[PDB]
Amino acid sequence: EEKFIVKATNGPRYVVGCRRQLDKSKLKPGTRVALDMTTLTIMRYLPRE
Amino acid sequence: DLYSRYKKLQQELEFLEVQEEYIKDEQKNLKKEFLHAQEEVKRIQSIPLVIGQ
Amino acid sequence: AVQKVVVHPLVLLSVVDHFNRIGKVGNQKRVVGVLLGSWQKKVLDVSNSFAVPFDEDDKDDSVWFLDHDYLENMYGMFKKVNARERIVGWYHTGPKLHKNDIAINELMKRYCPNSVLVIIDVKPKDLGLPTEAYISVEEVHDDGTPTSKTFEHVTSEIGAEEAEEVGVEHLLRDIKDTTVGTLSQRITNQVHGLKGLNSKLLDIRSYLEKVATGKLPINHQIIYQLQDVFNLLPDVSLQEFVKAFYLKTNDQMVVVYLASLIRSVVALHNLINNKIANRDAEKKEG
Amino acid sequence: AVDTAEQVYISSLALLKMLKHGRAGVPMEVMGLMLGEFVDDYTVRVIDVFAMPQSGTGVSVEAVDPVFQAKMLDMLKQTGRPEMVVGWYHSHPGFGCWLSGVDINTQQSFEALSERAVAVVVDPIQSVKGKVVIDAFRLINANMMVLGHEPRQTTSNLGHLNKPSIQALIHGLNRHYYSITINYRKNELEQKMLLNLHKKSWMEGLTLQDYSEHCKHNESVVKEMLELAKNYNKAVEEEDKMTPEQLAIKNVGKQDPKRHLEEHVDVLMTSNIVQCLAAMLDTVVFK
Numbered sequence: 001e002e003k004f005i006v007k008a009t010n011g012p013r014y015v016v017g018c019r020r021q022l023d024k025s026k027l028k029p030g031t032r033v034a035l036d037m038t039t040l041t042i043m044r045y046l047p048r049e
Numbered sequence: 050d051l052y053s054r055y056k057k058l059q060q061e062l063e064f065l066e067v068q069e070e071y072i073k074d075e076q077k078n079l080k081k082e083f084l085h086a087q088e089e090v091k092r093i094q095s096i097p098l099v100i101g102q
Numbered sequence: 103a104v105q106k107v108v109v110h111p112l113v114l115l116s117v118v119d120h121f122n123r124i125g126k127v128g129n130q131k132r133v134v135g136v137l138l139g140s141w142q143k144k145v146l147d148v149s150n151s152f153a154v155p156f157d158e159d160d161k162d163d164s165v166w167f168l169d170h171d172y173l174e175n176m177y178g179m180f181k182k183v184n185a186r187e188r189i190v191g192w193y194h195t196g197p198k199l200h201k202n203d204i205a206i207n208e209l210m211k212r213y214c215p216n217s218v219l220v221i222i223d224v225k226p227k228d229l230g231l232p233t234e235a236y237i238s239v240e241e242v243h244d245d246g247t248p249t250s251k252t253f254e255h256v257t258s259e260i261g262a263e264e265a266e267e268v269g270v271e272h273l274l275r276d277i278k279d280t281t282v283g284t285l286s287q288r289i290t291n292q293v294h295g296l297k298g299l300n301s302k303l304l305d306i307r308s309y310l311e312k313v314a315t316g317k318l319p320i321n322h323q324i325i326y327q328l329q330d331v332f333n334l335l336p337d338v339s340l341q342e343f344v345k346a347f348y349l350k351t352n353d354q355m356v357v358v359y360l361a362s363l364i365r366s367v368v369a370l371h372n373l374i375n376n377k378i379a380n381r382d383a384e385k386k387e388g
Numbered sequence: 389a390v391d392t393a394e395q396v397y398i399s400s401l402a403l404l405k406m407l408k409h410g411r412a413g414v415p416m417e418v419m420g421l422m423l424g425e426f427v428d429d430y431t432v433r434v435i436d437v438f439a440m441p442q443s444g445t446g447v448s449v450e451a452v453d454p455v456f457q458a459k460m461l462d463m464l465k466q467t468g469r470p471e472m473v474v475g476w477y478h479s480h481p482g483f484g485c486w487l488s489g490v491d492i493n494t495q496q497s498f499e500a501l502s503e504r505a506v507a508v509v510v511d512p513i514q515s516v517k518g519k520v521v522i523d524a525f526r527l528i529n530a531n532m533m534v535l536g537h538e539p540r541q542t543t544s545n546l547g548h549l550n551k552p553s554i555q556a557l558i559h560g561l562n563r564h565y566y567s568i569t570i571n572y573r574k575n576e577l578e579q580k581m582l583l584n585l586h587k588k589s590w591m592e593g594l595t596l597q598d599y600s601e602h603c604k605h606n607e608s609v610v611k612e613m614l615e616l617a618k619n620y621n622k623a624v625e626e627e628d629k630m631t632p633e634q635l636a637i638k639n640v641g642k643q644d645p646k647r648h649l650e651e652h653v654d655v656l657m658t659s660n661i662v663q664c665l666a667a668m669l670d671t672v673v674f675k
């Protein structure tokens with residue numbers, strides 16, 4: 001629940017952790033998110049259109 | 050040499066006795082260094098990574 | 103406003119640099135530097151800082167020397183290279199709090215926003231936390247004394263972001279991590295008594311002295327609440343806590359069972375090998 | 389035509405500043421400077437180290453502003469930092485820590501003043517947090533190609549310079565290129581201060597705060613962890629019921645990599661917390 005698996009658009013797969021800012025509300029699967037080049041943290045998510 | 054064997058052996062007694070605190074130091078320190086290196090190679094492993102096959 | 107702040111070792115090591123570049127002056131008075139950080143977020147975070155020359159007078163304590171040009175230049179260039187950090191407040195290495203410090207902080211109270219004051223020691227003989235974060239605010243006094251700048255204690259923690267931990271750990275190669283076990287815990291369980299001992303001994307003596315033997319009404323009123331806290335525990339007879347002691351000792355019994363059983367499991371391979379290996383080695387020896 | 393053995397002295401100052409420069413070590417090319425004082429030929433000490441504002445041009449000899457340089461240096465002269473620049477440092481993220489054409493050219497241009505010109509390249513990006521160890525760089529002369537490469541004494545430190553054991557870049561780029569050893573310096577003040585500060589960093593303010601917390605959490609939190617511990621231990625024991633059969637069959641060789649011992653020992657180590665905090669609770673209750 002704390003750490004999940006992410007899928008990049010380019011096709012390689014990775015895994016990240018959980019930032020102390022965001023909560024487990026939007027952390028649920030089925031939602032496209034965003035990552036950082038350093039430490040692979042999460043600033044926010046990426047809502048589909 | 051018969052009575053001298055005692056006094057000559059006493060040196061070996063002290064020499065074998067002095068190794069006690071030594072092996073104490075070794076066994077107490079090298080385990081701390083063991084867990085040190087263990088956590089050193091443990092912290093190498095990180096959660097973020099790439100998944101292969 | 104700010105519940106807690108984060109102070110990185112880098113600034114205190116910059117104070118170590120202040121004690122470095124001295125070069126045997128023969129003055130070595132208090133030196134006021136300029137602390138930098140992020141006031142945007144609720145929690146304060148210290149990254150890096152710089153140093154400005156600060157001098158005072160022997161007799162007159164109202165003498166304080168700062169520089170506006172050097173400050174604007176250093177902060178200007180620092181903002182030029184890094185826009186993620188701005189000005190917050192200042193700090194001094196003086197063990198004692200001077201009366202002129204309100205006038206020294208008044209400048210940054212005017213030009214800049216509210217500044218936080220940090221007091222450290224010149225000689226690291228203090229076992230306790232060297233860094234004390236003091237916020238500058240104006241509070242209403244109950245006794246009716248005129249409104250003045252009051253320093254309130256703010257809790258703080260010493261930590262690093264990413265690489266600083268590695269740098270420190272590499273430069274030291276002495277200190278050990280948490281390392282749950284016997285020695286790491288028992289060391290704390292030993293020395294903590296002294297940690298409380300030296301502190302309390304250094305405190306309650308000067309306290310007892312200055313209360314009866316002294317003046318300048320620092321508002322002793324809070325110390326009645328101190329003594330009240332000391333009276334919050336009127337020697338409980340533990341009679342109600344007997345069941346709790348029973349549960350704790352029961353958990354102790356659980357620890358006993360677990361230890362005995364597990365060690366009994368470990369003894370298997372040893373008390374097998376000690377026989378089967380020795381007898382085979384002996385019979386195959388000759 | 390004389391050459392001695394040089395060793396670069398590195399303090400915690402430049403190290404930490406290069407760690408902040410490591411946070412500044414973004415793929416955008418950055419500039420840095422190092423200052424110090426030369427007591428003699430074969431020793432070099434660095435003290436004052438700062439960063440430089442980023443640019444779109446990247447690392448170049450044109451990127452460095454001479455008037456701004458001399459200005460900041462003068463501002464350091466009026467202050468308590470009377471040290472001349474001993475060289476310059478930078479970062480080379482992701483393409484390796486080696487030096488390109490422009491880099492060695494601006495190095496050639498910046499070494500016109502100082503014969504030493506210490507070159508330091510930090511790349512925390514692909515560098516694991518396990519080791520912060522860095523390797524300083526040097527520039528060999530182009531007229532020494534006829535004679536031997538490195539006429540340096542004290543060959544005992546080459547094993548300490550063997551830390552970059554990579555089988556590619558070293559003897560691959562070894563032509564007209566080499567490195568220099570790195571050592572540190574620490575006094576009693578820095579030692580005691582940093583040790584006390586770090587110990588306090590791993591400790592609490594009054595130090596009596598978060599202890600009793602866990603002491604009273606032993607009956608709530610730890611208990612569940614003890615239950616899970618018993619679950620895993622039982623999960624081992626069910627196999628331990630199968631073990632004496634194998635011990636009654638083979639006994640020759642070990643096909644099981646699982647030790648089954650040290651882990652349970654560690655479980656006991658976690659179980660000793662209750663015993664260790666018991667005396668703590670006793671001291672709290674007593675006085």
Ligand SMILES: [Zn+2]
Pocket residue numbers: 480481483
């Ligand atoms: Zn590049």
